[PDB]
């Protein structure tokens, strides 16, 4: 990440001193000792998952005493939750029911 000197406002570089790593200016004496953990997270875009779960994938989220689906009122349906973008997104819930003479997709 860009961080800039309070004195002259040139761009800082990270270098190493005799006791700590420092943010340092190239044009003035200013240095800033890294005393504690500092971080910067990118969170890039993941792949699409839409065509990855279709067609009898290896899902696993089903559990004992799980709810029945609302149309058929039978537990013959899978349900899962996934991030669609990066993991800062709140996870979305989705479910699909597959029964005899009955095909549907629901949200």
């Amino acid at each position: 990440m860009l961080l800039f000197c309070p004195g002259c406002g040139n761009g800082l570089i990270v270098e190493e001193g005799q006791r700590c790593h420092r943010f340092s200016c190239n044009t003035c004496p200013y240095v800033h000792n890294i005393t504690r953990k500092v971080t910067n997270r990118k969170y890039p875009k993941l792949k699409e998952v839409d065509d990855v779960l279709g067609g009898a994938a290896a899902w696993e989220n089903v559990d004992s005493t799980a709810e029945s689906c609302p149309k058929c009122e039978h537990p013959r349906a899978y349900f899962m939750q996934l991030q669609t973008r990066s993991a800062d997104e709140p996870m979305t819930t989705f479910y699909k029911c597959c029964n005899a003479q009955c095909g549907h997709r629901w949200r």
Binding site: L3, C5, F23, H32, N33, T35, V38
Partner: protein, 186 residues
């Protein structure tokens, strides 16, 4: 480098990744409570958005002119320096200034009451500055430092410089061209 790398079917435990990640960087060399190692809390490096300067720590919406004047009246009685931009000509005549219908500015007028400032219902704000009413709106929200300073050349070669205070908010005054024109269309 061995290329035929091996893999297994077992599912990674959630906490096992979390605690492995934790142990990789939670180590700290903060034990050096010494002068060099110490760091000045009021000279942190500047993260680039100036409202968002704090990147390292000890651990927005937009206001409107009705709200600005309400905060400085009820919630806080402290005085504050606004900075306001007026139209290029005020509705006056330069008094005896030896002219031509030239522009009128605040430098030409004389001290006293100059007008009245009205806050209406629904947040409309007007500056009634004569017979005419000028509209007042919030200017660009500056977040760099601004200082209001006197300079006085009290002597031929020397003088005094004095800092009177910081300036936070900008107001823009403009003529209400719809009202001026709805009087007498063309």
């Amino acid at each position: 480098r061995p290329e035929v790398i091996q893999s297994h079917s077992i599912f990674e435990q959630g906490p096992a990744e979390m605690m492995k990640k934790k142990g990789n960087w939670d180590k700290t060399v903060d034990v050096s409570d010494m002068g060099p190692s110490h760091i000045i809390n009021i000279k942190k490096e500047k993260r680039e958005t100036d409202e968002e300067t704090k990147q390292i720590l000890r651990m927005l919406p937009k206001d409107v002119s009705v709200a600005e004047l309400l905060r400085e009246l009820s919630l806080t009685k402290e005085e504050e320096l606004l900075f306001l931009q007026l139209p290029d000509t005020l509705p006056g005549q330069p008094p005896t200034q030896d002219i031509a219908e030239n522009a009128c500015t605040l430098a030409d007028l004389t001290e006293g009451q100059v007008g009245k400032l009205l806050i209406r219902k629904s947040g409309r704000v007007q500056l009634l500055l004569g017979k005419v009413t000028l509209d007042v709106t919030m200017g660009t929200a500056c977040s760099f430092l601004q200082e209001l300073v006197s300079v006085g050349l009290g002597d031929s070669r020397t003088g005094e410089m004095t800092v009177l205070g910081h300036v936070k908010h900008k107001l823009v005054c403009s003529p209400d061209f719809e009202s001026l024109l709805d009087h007498k269309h063309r």
